[PDB]
Amino acid sequence: EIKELLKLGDLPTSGQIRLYDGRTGEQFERPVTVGYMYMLKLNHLVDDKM
Amino acid sequence: GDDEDSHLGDFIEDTTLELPLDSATTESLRAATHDVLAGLTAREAKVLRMR
Amino acid sequence: KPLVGTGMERAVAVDSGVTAVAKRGGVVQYVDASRIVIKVNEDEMYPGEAGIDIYNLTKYTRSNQNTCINQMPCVSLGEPVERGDVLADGPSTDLGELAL
Amino acid sequence: LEARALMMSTNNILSPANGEPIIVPSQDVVLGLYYMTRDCVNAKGEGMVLTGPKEAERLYRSGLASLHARVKVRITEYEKDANGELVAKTSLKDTTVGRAILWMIVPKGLPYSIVNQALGKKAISKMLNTCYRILGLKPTVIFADQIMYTGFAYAARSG
Amino acid sequence: VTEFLKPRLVDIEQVSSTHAKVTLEPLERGFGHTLGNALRRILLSSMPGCAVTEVEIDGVLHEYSTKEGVQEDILEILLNLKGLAVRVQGKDEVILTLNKSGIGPVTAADITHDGDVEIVKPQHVICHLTDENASISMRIKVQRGRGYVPASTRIHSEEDERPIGRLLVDACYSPVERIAYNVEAARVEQRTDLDKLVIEMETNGTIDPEEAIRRAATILAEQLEAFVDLRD
Amino acid sequence: SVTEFLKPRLVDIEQVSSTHAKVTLEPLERGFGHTLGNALRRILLSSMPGCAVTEVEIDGVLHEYSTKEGVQEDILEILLNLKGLAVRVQGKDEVILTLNKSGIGPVTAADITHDGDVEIVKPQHVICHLTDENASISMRIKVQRGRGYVPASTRLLVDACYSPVERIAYNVEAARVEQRTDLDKLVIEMETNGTIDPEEAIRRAATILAEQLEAFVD
Amino acid sequence: TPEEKLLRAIFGEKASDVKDSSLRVPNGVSGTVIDVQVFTRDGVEKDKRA
Amino acid sequence: RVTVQDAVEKIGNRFDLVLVAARRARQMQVGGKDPLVPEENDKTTVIALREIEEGLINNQILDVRERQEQQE
């Protein structure tokens, strides 16, 4: 169903698209996995520690 | 407790210390007073050192 | 809100006291960054009552961990509500769901 | 002078429990060096005879050849087979393009068979170790840094 | 060999108000990606803009408060004033005034224009007056810069001293949100290997694509002039 | 202001030899390290004119691979030796240079016949070893002009690296001017084959890139 | 001590007698002072801010 | 200075090297002296260690110079 819901968009079923390097602009070999992970800021801050 | 098993006495500070910056400033001012009194005549210097 | 959740988020957000939930359906008589006034549906008036009930939002306040607890209104003027609908999004919720 | 002379990080590189170097590259580095030093049967530019590691790198970076494309490459390796004399010897090896691109970082005294295989994890630790048993501490610190740099670079390019 | 054909922009396509696709037709082999990556990096980095830099709201002390009658915290009103897309014509800063009262949304159309300032998106909603009687007024402070200057680094110590009711919003002077370049073979009767470069730039409305590319090529040729002759 | 950017106030140009150098450009705007280094590397290593050997006829043996006696080095090793022959050709675009030798003396590049328009930067460049007094070899090599690298697959023909750079790599470090510590420090490092010193190839590529941007600068 | 006596005698900046044990912001924090509550005991009268 | 291998080789010990470098760097820093090696804006530590590399400094040399100083 993930794969189907990818086909609903025009995204690839494999989940791996081909990416280009920012500084040079030459495509990474062997495509990479990019999606939307839901990140959280944990309450371990660097100025509560330094 | 339970943070480090440190009893209460570890956090009571000593407020009678001349902190090393304070002693540094003291002795700097001492040397500066000396090198100022150098720029006075002998009478003025003796009377200001002794007064 | 999480793009990939489970369906637990609304429950965790509501059942905790961060989001201001309606007590009776009605219309949002007046909204504001600090308060929501609801004019109850006449079915739920409790005939002695005046009719409208007020929710005062908890603005920028200090939690135990120095974070900011702050409720934001979700509804808008003249919009219906039903009992159990959230009016104020609490800290780290989004339209009623737990959004960490 | 106790920190500089004694505890500086470029002095302690061997485990004091056992003299194996404690500067083994860990996970992006070894995956970089493995991906680059690992041939496949038919990549771009198969069986070209490059003139040497410089040309293999210039070919790969312009994108004319792939990082694992078995080519004949002319390699000059320096072997201290002497009273520490460092005689030079040039030959024509069969290596991938990445094998030779990586040969550019290896110091003189090391043979060429050190990089001519896939170079997993133990291959890299043994590479640092033979560099230390031949050349000592300064070339090994330089080699370790160059290994980390190239491993991270070709692992990012690995995608 | 003989020589390089120098590229030149054959056409610009305002397929939307903001989305544009320029083209640089004749490019020798290997210069599509050189020019394209350099151009995307310059454009995504160094483009002038008119970020709103402060707000001074009547009756408000800090961002963490609520104005009676407008249903947004002052924090959220400032966050809505961040993305306000404004293009000044003559000065490197300007002080827009926004007066409004009555029940309804407060879009960017509610700001009075100096004539030197053009709000590109006048539908962009700023706040919501949710009171028959409530009234708000701001002195927004647009100014032209480049990059991203947070209020923190902006306030090094101060200019001389800043009054208590003046809020510093985080400035992002960058018209462009997205660059995406395709290089593709160009059907020319003379040579076949030549390719054309096609730059999809996605401004926010306040940068003409031709002026964006010209400014990029100027920023690049400046450094290349610094490179041309060495020196040491 | 808002249009000024920065320029490398200190560009230090080391040279570790006659043909290998290293140029650091200290202060540059943040990220211009890569947008300048990559542009220059791509230009130097993909489109930088120069003359190089393209095809050879070894005068008798065959097409590849070979069977040639009286030459200590197997053929295609002679082709490797020929690819590295750094030649700079005058007004004649292409020229066919013929080399013949007889003896046991090792064959170097000095032994080719002088043609005026063509010059060899390294005449001592070994090409083959005869190894027999009776052994003697003749070859017709063709120097041609082109842009960058052009392999033999795309084309006894040899790969042609016309571009006079044998290797260029650039590294990008950190710099702080007085307060801006997010600045950038370019550290170019290049070796040529001899037709032009490193600093010359660098500025030649910079000029090419500048002229490509000629229809938009103002 | 002397030389402090001599200093204050040369500049006439006589002694305070009163420490500056005041409340200054901790180091590294930079915020807005969003609120101030005051608590005066029933003996202490009150100040203008109170 | 990264690796002190040459300085260690000249003296042939790793604690005595620290001690010799420390006393020479104390001469060069507080007691006041001239580096026997061209200091490239280095602290007295690195100057002392580099000097020990070139053979200009060791314990024998330093005690001999102390003798000469007394003969001053």
UniProtKB/Swiss-Prot annotation, chain C:
Cystines in this chain: none
Top-level lineage group: Bacteria
Family: Belongs to the RNA polymerase beta chain family.
Biological role stated in the UniProt entry: DNA-dependent RNA polymerase catalyzes the transcription of DNA into RNA using the four ribonucleoside triphosphates as substrates.
Record note on quaternary structure: The RNAP catalytic core consists of 2 alpha, 1 beta, 1 beta' and 1 omega subunit. When a sigma factor is associated with the core the holoenzyme is formed, which can initiate transcription.
Protein name: DNA-directed RNA polymerase subunit beta
Taxonomic source organism: Escherichia coli O157:H7
GN (gene name): rpoB
UniProtKB/Swiss-Prot annotation, chain D:
Industrial and biotechnological uses noted in the record: Co-administration of salinamide and rifampicin or salinamide and myxopyronin suppresses the emergence of resistance to both antibiotics.
Sections of the chain in a coiled coil: none
Post-translational note: Acetylated on several lysine residues in the presence of glucose.
Family: Belongs to the RNA polymerase beta' chain family.
Description of how the protein assembles with itself and partners: The RNAP catalytic core consists of 2 alpha, 1 beta, 1 beta' and 1 omega subunit. When a sigma factor is associated with the core the holoenzyme is formed, which can initiate transcription. The rRNA transcription and antitermination complex (rrnTAC) consists of RNAP, NusA, NusB, NusE (rpsJ), NusG, SubB, ribosomal protein S4, DNA and precursor rRNA; S4 is more flexible than other subunits.
General function of this protein: DNA-dependent RNA polymerase (RNAP) catalyzes the transcription of DNA into RNA using the four ribonucleoside triphosphates as substrates.
Entry protein name: DNA-directed RNA polymerase subunit beta'
Native source organism of the sequence: Escherichia coli (strain K12)
First and last residues shown, out of full length: 478 to 636 of 1407
Swiss-Prot record, chain E:
Outcome after substituting E161K: 5-fold decrease in CRP-class II promoter-dependent transcription
Keyword tags: Acetylation, ADP-ribosylation, DNA-directed RNA polymerase, Nucleotidyltransferase, Transcription, Transferase
PTM: (Microbial infection) ADP-ribosylated on both alpha subunits by the phage T4 protein ModA. ADP-ribosylated on only one of the alpha subunits by the phage T4 protein Alt.
Impact after mutating R41C: In rpoA112; temperature-sensitive, blocks RNA polymerase assembly
Subunit structure: Homodimer. The RNAP catalytic core consists of 2 alpha, 1 beta, 1 beta' and 1 omega subunit. When a sigma factor is associated with the core the holoenzyme is formed, which can initiate transcription. Both the N- and C-terminus interact with different regions of transcriptional regulator CRP. The rRNA transcription and antitermination complex (rrnTAC) consists of RNAP, NusA, NusB, NusE (rpsJ), NusG, SubB, ribosomal protein S4, DNA and precursor rRNA; S4 is more flexible than other subunits.
Catalytic function, reaction form: RNA(n) + a ribonucleoside 5'-triphosphate = RNA(n+1) + diphosphate
Range covered out of full length: 5 to 236 of 329
Species: Escherichia coli (strain K12)
Name listed for the protein in its UniProt record: DNA-directed RNA polymerase subunit alpha
Family: Belongs to the RNA polymerase alpha chain family.
Swiss-Prot record, chain F:
Family (UniProt): Belongs to the RNA polymerase alpha chain family.
Organism: Escherichia coli (strain K12)
Catalytic activity annotation: RNA(n) + a ribonucleoside 5'-triphosphate = RNA(n+1) + diphosphate
GO annotation, biological process: bacterial-type flagellum assembly; bacterial-type flagellum-dependent cell motility; cell motility; cellular response to cell envelope stress; DNA-templated transcription initiation; intracellular iron ion homeostasis; nitrate assimilation; regulation of DNA-templated transcription elongation
GO cellular component entries: cytoplasm; cytosol; cytosolic DNA-directed RNA polymerase complex; membrane; transcription elongation factor complex
Documented effect of changing R176C: In rpoA101; temperature-sensitive
Domain notes: The N-terminal domain is essential for RNAP assembly and basal transcription, whereas the C-terminal domain is involved in interaction with transcriptional regulators (such as CRP) and with upstream promoter elements.
The keyword Nucleotidyltransferase is annotated on this UniProt entry: yes
Keywords carried by this UniProt record: Acetylation, ADP-ribosylation, DNA-directed RNA polymerase, Nucleotidyltransferase, Transcription, Transferase
Coiled coil ranges: none
Modification after translation, per record: (Microbial infection) ADP-ribosylated on both alpha subunits by the phage T4 protein ModA. ADP-ribosylated on only one of the alpha subunits by the phage T4 protein Alt.
GO MF: DNA binding; DNA-directed RNA polymerase activity; protein dimerization activity
E.C. code: 2.7.7.6
Region (Alpha N-terminal domain (alpha-NTD)): 1-218
Keyword flag Acetylation: yes
Record protein name field: DNA-directed RNA polymerase subunit alpha
